[PDB]
Design a protein around this ligand. Structure first.
Ligand SMILES: NC(=O)[C@H]1CCCN(C(=O)Cn2cc(Br)cc(Cl)c2=O)C1
Ligand SMILES: [Zn+2]
Length: 139
């Protein structure tokens, strides 16, 4: 679980989106595991507008924040699930770190703000769905 609350938007993993998220749908991309929905309350999350490759992410499975080096957003293959078939997920950044089912939603942050959220993992790796390119979240 976990979400980014920026302005009048809520950003969540598309596979974890609720009925309210779908009822108040703004934008969704299956290939990125992102869903953005509208919220009546003003949220204060600063989105990073950078090309950082180091940051800190929150790991719910360890109740700890971890510093990580991560790759540039790219198209990386991800295996089937009760949510998605086997496909290439886009705008995904890999990092060496701990993650296990239940960690999706944990925010990855850098000095410039929110970079993205935990979307994939396993094998001593953690994958993050980038949100820095979504410029409309601030406007
Ligand atoms: N974005 C997706 O396709 C995910 C949908 C839910 C299932 N996906 C996963 O990666 C499940 N998972 C998540 C984390 Br975090 C760590 C591990 Cl070890 C793991 O197996 C894939
Ligand atoms: Zn940054």
């Amino acid at each position: 679980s976990g979400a980014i609350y920026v302005g009048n938007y809520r950003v969540v993993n598309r596979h974890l989106a609720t009925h309210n998220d779908w009822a108040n749908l703004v934008w969704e991309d299956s290939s990125r595991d992102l869903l953005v929905s509208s919220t009546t309350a003003q949220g204060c999350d600063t989105i990073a507008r950078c090309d950082c490759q180091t940051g800190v992410y929150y790991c719910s499975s360890r109740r700890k924040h971890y510093p990580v080096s991560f790759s540039k957003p790219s198209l990386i293959f991800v295996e089937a699930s009760e949510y998605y078939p086997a496909r290439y997920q886009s705008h995904l950044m890999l990092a060496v770190g701990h993650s296990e089912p239940g960690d999706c939603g944990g925010i990855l942050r850098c000095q410039h703000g929110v970079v993205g959220i935990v979307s994939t993992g396993g094998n001593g790796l953690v994958g993050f769905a980038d949100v820095r390119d979504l410029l409309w979240l601030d406007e």
